[PDB]
Design a protein around this ligand. Structure first.
Ligand SMILES: [Mg+2]
Ligand SMILES: [Mg+2]
Ligand SMILES: [Mg+2]
Ligand SMILES: [Mg+2]
Ligand SMILES: [Mg+2]
Ligand SMILES: [Mg+2]
Ligand SMILES: [Mg+2]
Ligand SMILES: [Mg+2]
Ligand SMILES: [Mg+2]
Ligand SMILES: [Mg+2]
Ligand SMILES: [Mg+2]
Ligand SMILES: [Mg+2]
Ligand SMILES: [Mg+2]
Ligand SMILES: [Mg+2]
Ligand SMILES: [Mg+2]
Ligand SMILES: [Mg+2]
Ligand SMILES: [Mg+2]
Ligand SMILES: [Mg+2]
Ligand SMILES: [Mg+2]
Ligand SMILES: [Mg+2]
Ligand SMILES: [Mg+2]
Ligand SMILES: [Mg+2]
Ligand SMILES: [Mg+2]
Ligand SMILES: [Mg+2]
Ligand SMILES: [Mg+2]
Ligand SMILES: [Mg+2]
Ligand SMILES: [Mg+2]
Ligand SMILES: [Mg+2]
Ligand SMILES: [Mg+2]
Ligand SMILES: [Mg+2]
Ligand SMILES: [Mg+2]
Ligand SMILES: [Mg+2]
Ligand SMILES: [Mg+2]
Ligand SMILES: [Mg+2]
Ligand SMILES: [Mg+2]
Ligand SMILES: [Mg+2]
Ligand SMILES: [Mg+2]
Ligand SMILES: [Mg+2]
Ligand SMILES: [Mg+2]
Ligand SMILES: [Mg+2]
Ligand SMILES: [Mg+2]
Ligand SMILES: [Mg+2]
Ligand SMILES: [Mg+2]
Ligand SMILES: [Mg+2]
Ligand SMILES: [Mg+2]
Ligand SMILES: [Mg+2]
Ligand SMILES: [Mg+2]
Ligand SMILES: [Mg+2]
Ligand SMILES: [Mg+2]
Ligand SMILES: [Mg+2]
Ligand SMILES: [Mg+2]
Ligand SMILES: [Mg+2]
Ligand SMILES: [Mg+2]
Ligand SMILES: [Mg+2]
Ligand SMILES: [Mg+2]
Ligand SMILES: [Mg+2]
Ligand SMILES: [Mg+2]
Ligand SMILES: [Mg+2]
Ligand SMILES: [Mg+2]
Ligand SMILES: [Mg+2]
Ligand SMILES: [Mg+2]
Ligand SMILES: [Mg+2]
Ligand SMILES: [Mg+2]
Ligand SMILES: [Mg+2]
Ligand SMILES: [Mg+2]
Ligand SMILES: [Mg+2]
Ligand SMILES: [Mg+2]
Ligand SMILES: [Mg+2]
Ligand SMILES: [Mg+2]
Ligand SMILES: [Mg+2]
Ligand SMILES: [Mg+2]
Ligand SMILES: [Mg+2]
Ligand SMILES: [Mg+2]
Ligand SMILES: [Mg+2]
Ligand SMILES: [Mg+2]
Ligand SMILES: [Mg+2]
Ligand SMILES: [Mg+2]
Ligand SMILES: [Mg+2]
Ligand SMILES: [Mg+2]
Ligand SMILES: [Mg+2]
Ligand SMILES: [Mg+2]
Ligand SMILES: [Mg+2]
Ligand SMILES: [Mg+2]
Ligand SMILES: [Mg+2]
Ligand SMILES: [Zn+2]
Lengths: 183, 149, 78, 53, 62, 104, 158
RNA sequence: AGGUUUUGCGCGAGUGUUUGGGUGUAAAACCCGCACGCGUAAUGAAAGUGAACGUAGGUGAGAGCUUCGGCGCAUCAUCGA
RNA sequence: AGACUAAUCGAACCAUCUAGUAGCUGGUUACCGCCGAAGUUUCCCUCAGGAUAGCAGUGUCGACCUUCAGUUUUAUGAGGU
RNA sequence: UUAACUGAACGUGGGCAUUCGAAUGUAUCGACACUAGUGGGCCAUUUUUGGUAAGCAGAACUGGCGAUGCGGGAUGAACCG
RNA sequence: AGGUGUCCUAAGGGGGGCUCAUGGAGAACAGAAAUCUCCAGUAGAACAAAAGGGUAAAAGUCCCCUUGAUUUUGAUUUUCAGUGUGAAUACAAACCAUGAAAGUGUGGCCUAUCGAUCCUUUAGUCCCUCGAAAUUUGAGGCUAGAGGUGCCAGAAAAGUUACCACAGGGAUAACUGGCUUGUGGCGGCCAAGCGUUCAUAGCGACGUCGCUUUUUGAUCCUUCGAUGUCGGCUCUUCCUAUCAUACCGAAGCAGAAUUCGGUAAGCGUUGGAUUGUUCACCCACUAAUAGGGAACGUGAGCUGGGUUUAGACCGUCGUGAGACAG
């Protein structure tokens, strides 16, 4: 006997992508070599984000990029391991160069129209193997419809599952002191 | 085993039968040992016993792994910053309680000993005074180490 | 209701006459203090009133039966 | 019998619904029939347009 | 028929199975329950002190 | 239990908004109307064959009721309602008790 | 079997022997600020702003101050998790606590004692340590001759 | 048939050809568009009204980047508009 | 005599509605590997049954955060066996 | 808030590491999502209630059987290892 | 061991003067006990009620003025899922009460005294809708109370079956077996006294220690997809706490007849009247007519009188169907 609390405990994070895209398999091979034989911490972070599922790689927008292109960051390279989306509100698009997993049709057109350049994760490794002069970005993880229903309960101000919304669907008892109590 | 004495044995790194560790006696640790009386036997080592244990059963914790110590390069790589570079320094630090005793003792993996050669007493779960084997026996623990080592 | 109320009316009258014997004899009153004496007669005053009134029901009459008994029995016992 | 956080169900399946089910396996067969009827009608009205103003 | 009434035999072991979790303390506690009169004035106080420190670049230089 | 015929308390009138003398009167429920929506629906449910269609209460346990006082402002004729506790004998405007004049 | 608000408090809330009567008046002259460490001790005479019997003896942190009461934060242990509780207590029940005074005394002493050494230039060994085993010494038997003892025979007292 | 969370895939402020029409080597495959569904704006019983003081804010932590001074994603707490 | 009415009677026999409902008995089909329970809280015409919290598994993300603990020591409070 | 720039909370600037201020361990850090079985329990040391008593009925802290073989008690779910 | 479905315009709120229960010594009628005066008096009194806590220039008592038992909504504590109901604590914004003033007051000194959805009814603003457009009736909405569920988180509800049915339960009774031995039965220890005299020939009060499972209780572990449930007849064997027989020891044993004890289960222990009886009670014989076990031995061994299906009669009970260890 050995009197241990835990035994044969597995890891908690993905160690390989669950997707079977052939091109993505090549991209993992490249960065798996780079991370092993380079001291730059930028390579290790990029490798893990390639494994993540779609809900853990939310899209980023052109507006969110322009937000972080201020206060002395107008000359750096934006790297986004996700999709990049055009924003209809932004009327004037600044000049930037972006390395992203994929672009929408309109986002690619508007970036190069202003005088920018659209890169690729493989071309990024060819130009900046150590990731110098780069900034990483993420999308809003919690900006999803399904997250609003998480942890429903009294005094929590969450969203309920209703087949429709109106005065006939819930409200009533338990939502106003005029009928019993409130939550 | 009751829940409180079990937790103390976990903090002393004694999770298996016939294990052994070095501890320096203070008021903070003397009370911990007195709680787990009917589970352990302890005493005062001499120069030979500490010397034999390190040479024959000496293993070191390196990156969370049990690496047998057979070359001086292993000891220096992990205890060099405290001034210990050889296996004679490790023995000196343990035997004469030194300023860096805590790091030296925690480096050693808990010792694993075999059953004693001559056997125990007729009933080995009384106190040493009554005629058993568990408890404090002062210098008489050297004889027990010879058999179990 | 006519029978149930009428039954409780007699029992309440019986105990009021019953307790008058204890307070009247000199033997029991000799060792019993005034402070206990005047509290019994104070409780007896409003007991007389509700017999005259007609709105009293079985619940009200029965409640004061045990209330009067509980008060007097504490003095005699101790 | 609700057991967890669910949406309250309303499935109108308590009559004998199985007696009235209308599968559509004749979607392509019917289309061929209409095209045969249109060109037959157009042949009868040789120089005239098929429709009306 | 009759059955056991109540028990507490295995509750302590169940609770300690994956720890008794103490909520984490943190630098800025909430101001829920504090009396409103001090709460109203504290709002005006912080509004001014931000403006004054903002003017530190073209102004008071305290 | 007796309460005074008059008392002065807060009045929520549009122009009073202060303490003012009030008259005290007991509250009495009105007659049930014959054209309310609840009554009109109930009448239709009972027509034709089928019998009794809604429950009839039988197991009563309470012996008393809560007393509600209806007040009236002496200026703006505004009214208020104040509930009381449960009591058996209630009357308002009775004579006050006397202290120290015990006699049988 | 009943569960009232004050059930089982026959001896907890009672005043002691020869301690009934007037409340010492220095209680109302104390002052409190948020973040102070106070401990609760219920006084039987005052019947307003009296906390539940669970908090009689616990220690908490002030979080609100009002005209005649303070708000205290204490941690309650429901089965398998802790919960934060906020209670309102009249000042007749609270009292400043000496739990933290040893720490506050030691930090002031450490700062000044370290300052003088840095000017002088000697290590201090300031942090505390548990009791250590005794050291060697000598005991003389001059005019302290030992006396011999022995067990005593059985004897009947009564 | 209708819900819900998780995995893979396409397009992305949009998305869905197939009720239907054109066509065919004919129950396959390929092509076309007007409407419509869900999403892009909430809140009240209702008449109704309808989202920028600030580089889309202030403070404490934050991976990574950096001219070494600093700039600070996601998310957590807190005070405001 | 609850007797008899085709070996059937305290309500005949034949087909259909009908695969009538069951909080109750019985059964429920190849192999290997890793983790591993509960008979307890609150409510119910509830006590052979359900919902709710707990104990359990799997999928992960945030940092590798130096944070943590069924423990001892030192200082200081509460209790009525 | 005070007779009062006297206080109160939140702040700008500055000073204090040569040693971030008890022991031991860290073979297991924090947060979230979805869901299975269970809700008849029984035995023993110490404390203990009703009963003449029971292999009887009812509780508190902890360890066990149920869900578990192996070596001793000849045999024997719970005892010793 | 006890308590609650109430009671109160003050028994609620503010202020002020005074000190209680009881005891000692005194005064016309006057006494154990009426009213008056002085001294002592830590609560031994009083505070609506059950019990516990709390209170002395008061929280008790008398006197003076009053209605914070009011208006608008939020946060917190106890039971707890940190849901509801009940009750409770601390502030904020208004309007008042009391006092010279600081201050105190959001019902009763603290711990119990109570109630959803739907429907009905009253108060409030002068507000929203009746969908082709106006004006008055009527109806419907929004905010706060009341009418009630005591099985009190809240269905609308009388019996019988001995003519009976189905799904299940040894989670639950009626019989054996098992643990226990209170009651039942049987046996010891101490020695006040009885026995003419003399505690112990033969007995034994007041107390106290055990054994047995042929009495009856207590428990509900094994059997409800079944272990055939009273008694007698018949037949075998075992136990000893010995009725007779063999051989002996004691006496208040002269003989005869009896009484107490030991080794001993080898051998015997009956025929009839009444009752279904087990149990019992009389007649007669005899060396003697002892007590028990074996699934309360023994139904594919018998018998079927009793109990315990369906037919029928009486008495008491029930309006009735029907009930009764009559
Ligand atoms: Mg092994
Ligand atoms: Mg309503
Ligand atoms: Mg050998
Ligand atoms: Mg041995
Ligand atoms: Mg149970
Ligand atoms: Mg267990
Ligand atoms: Mg009306
Ligand atoms: Mg209505
Ligand atoms: Mg009609
Ligand atoms: Mg009808
Ligand atoms: Mg009709
Ligand atoms: Mg209790
Ligand atoms: Mg106390
Ligand atoms: Mg589906
Ligand atoms: Mg569209
Ligand atoms: Mg609208
Ligand atoms: Mg960093
Ligand atoms: Mg018949
Ligand atoms: Mg036939
Ligand atoms: Mg026939
Ligand atoms: Mg028929
Ligand atoms: Mg049929
Ligand atoms: Mg079927
Ligand atoms: Mg069937
Ligand atoms: Mg396995
Ligand atoms: Mg395992
Ligand atoms: Mg039951
Ligand atoms: Mg079962
Ligand atoms: Mg888990
Ligand atoms: Mg005591
Ligand atoms: Mg006690
Ligand atoms: Mg249950
Ligand atoms: Mg469940
Ligand atoms: Mg059971
Ligand atoms: Mg079950
Ligand atoms: Mg057993
Ligand atoms: Mg038990
Ligand atoms: Mg049992
Ligand atoms: Mg085992
Ligand atoms: Mg074995
Ligand atoms: Mg044995
Ligand atoms: Mg009782
Ligand atoms: Mg008053
Ligand atoms: Mg007063
Ligand atoms: Mg006064
Ligand atoms: Mg007292
Ligand atoms: Mg409870
Ligand atoms: Mg709550
Ligand atoms: Mg509550
Ligand atoms: Mg006030
Ligand atoms: Mg009072
Ligand atoms: Mg109060
Ligand atoms: Mg109501
Ligand atoms: Mg209703
Ligand atoms: Mg109109
Ligand atoms: Mg119309
Ligand atoms: Mg009603
Ligand atoms: Mg209930
Ligand atoms: Mg229903
Ligand atoms: Mg059983
Ligand atoms: Mg016996
Ligand atoms: Mg004599
Ligand atoms: Mg004798
Ligand atoms: Mg006797
Ligand atoms: Mg028996
Ligand atoms: Mg049985
Ligand atoms: Mg059976
Ligand atoms: Mg069988
Ligand atoms: Mg048989
Ligand atoms: Mg016979
Ligand atoms: Mg014999
Ligand atoms: Mg004999
Ligand atoms: Mg024989
Ligand atoms: Mg015969
Ligand atoms: Mg027997
Ligand atoms: Mg038999
Ligand atoms: Mg037979
Ligand atoms: Mg028989
Ligand atoms: Mg047989
Ligand atoms: Mg017969
Ligand atoms: Mg019959
Ligand atoms: Mg028949
Ligand atoms: Mg009759
Ligand atoms: Mg009969
Ligand atoms: Zn008015």
């Amino acid at each position: 006997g050995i009197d241990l609390r835990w035994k044969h405990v597995r890891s908690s994070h993905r160690k390989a992508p669950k997707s079977d895209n052939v091109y993505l398999k090549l991209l993992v091979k490249l960065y798996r070599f780079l991370a092993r034989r380079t001291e730059a911490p930028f390579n290790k972070v990029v490798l893990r984000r390639l494994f993540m599922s779609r809900i853990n790689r939310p899209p980023v927008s052109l507006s969110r990029i322009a937000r972080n292109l201020k206060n002395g960051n107008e000359k750096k390279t934006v790297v986004v391991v996700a999709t990049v989306t055009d924003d209809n509100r932004l009327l004037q698009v600044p000049k930037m160069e972006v390395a992203a997993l994929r672009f929408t049709a309109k986002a690619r057109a508007r970036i190069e129209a202003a005088g920018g350049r659209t890169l690729t994760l493989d071309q990024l490794a060819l130009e900046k193997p150590t990731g110098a002069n780069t900034l990483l970005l993420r999308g809003p993880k919690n900006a999803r419809e399904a997250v609003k229903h998480f942890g429903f309960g009294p005094h929590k101000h969450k969203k309920p599952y209703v087949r429709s919304k109106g005065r006939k669907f819930e409200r009533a008892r338990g939502r106003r002191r005029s009928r019993g109590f409130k939550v | 085993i009751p829940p409180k004495p079990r937790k103390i044995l976990q903090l002393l790194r004694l999770r298996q039968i016939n294990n052994g560790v070095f501890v320096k006696v203070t008021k903070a640790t003397a009370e911990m040992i007195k709680i787990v009386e009917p589970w352990v036997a302890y005493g005062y080592p001499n120069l030979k016993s500490v010397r034999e244990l390190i040479y024959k059963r000496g293993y070191g914790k390196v990156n969370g792994q049990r690496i047998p110590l057979t070359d001086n390069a292993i000891i220096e790589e992990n205890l060099g910053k405290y001034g210990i570079i050889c296996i004679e320094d490790l023995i000196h630090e343990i035997f004469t309680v030194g300023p860096n005793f805590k790091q030296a003792a925690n480096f050693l993996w808990p010792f694993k000993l075999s059953n004693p050669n001559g056997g125990f007493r007729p009933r080995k779960f009384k106190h040493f005074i009554e005629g058993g084997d568990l408890g404090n026996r002062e210098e008489h623990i050297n004889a027990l180490i010879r058999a179990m080592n | 209701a006519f029978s149930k109320r009428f039954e409780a009316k007699q029992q309440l009258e019986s105990y009021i006459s019953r307790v008058e014997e204890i307070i009247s004899d000199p033997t029991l009153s000799l060792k019993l203090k005034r402070g206990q004496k005047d509290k019994i007669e104070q409780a007896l005053s409003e007991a007389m009133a509700q017999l005259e009134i007609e709105d009293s029901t079985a619940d009200e009459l029965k409640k004061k039966e045990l209330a009067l008994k509980r008060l007097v029995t504490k003095a005699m016992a101790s | 019998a609700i057991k967890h956080n669910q949406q309250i169900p309303n499935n109108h399946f308590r009559k004998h619904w199985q007696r009235r089910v209308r599968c559509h396996f004749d979607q392509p067969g019917k289309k061929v029939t209409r095209r045969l009827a249109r060109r037959a009608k157009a042949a009868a009205l040789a120089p005239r347009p098929v429709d009306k103003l | 028929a009759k059955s056991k009434n109540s028990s507490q035999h295995n509750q302590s072991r169940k609770a300690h199975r994956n720890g008794i979790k103490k909520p984490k303390t943190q630098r800025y506690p909430s101001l829920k329950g504090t009396d409103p009169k001090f709460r109203r004035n504290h709002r005006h106080a912080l509004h001014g002190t931000a403006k004054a420190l903002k003017e530190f670049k073209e102004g008071k230089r305290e | 239990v007796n309460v005074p015929k008059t008392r002065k308390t807060f009045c929520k009138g549009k122009d009073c908004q202060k303490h003012t003398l009030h008259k005290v009167t007991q509250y009495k429920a009105g007659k049930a109307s014959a054209f309310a929506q609840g009554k009109r629906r109930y009448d239709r449910k009972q027509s034709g064959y089928g019998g009794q269609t809604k429950p009839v209460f039988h197991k009563k346990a309470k012996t008393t009721k809560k007393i509600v006082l209806r007040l009236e402002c002496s200026v703006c004729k505004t009214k208020k309602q104040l509930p009381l506790k449960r009591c058996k004998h209630f009357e308002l405007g009775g004579d006050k008790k006397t202290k120290g004049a015990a006699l049988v | 079997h009943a569960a009232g608000l004050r059930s089982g408090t026959r001896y907890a809330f009672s005043r002691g022997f020869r301690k009934h009567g007037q409340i010492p008046l220095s209680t109302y002259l104390r002052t409190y600020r948020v973040g102070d460490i106070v401990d609760i001790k219920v006084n039987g005479a005052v019947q307003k702003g009296m906390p539940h019997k669970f908090y009689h003896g616990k220690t908490g942190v002030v979080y609100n101050v009002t005209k005649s009461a303070v708000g205290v934060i204490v941690y309650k242990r429901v089965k398998h998790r802790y919960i934060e509780k906020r209670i309102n207590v009249r000042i007749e029940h609270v009292k400043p606590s000496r739990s933290r005074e040893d720490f506050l005394r030691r930090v002031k002493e450490n700062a000044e004692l370290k300052k003088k050494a840095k000017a002088e230039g000697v290590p201090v060994q300031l942090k505390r340590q548990p009791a250590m085993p005794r050291e060697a010494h000598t005991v003389s038997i001059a005019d302290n001759k030992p006396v011999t003892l022995a067990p005593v025979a059985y004897e009947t007292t009564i």
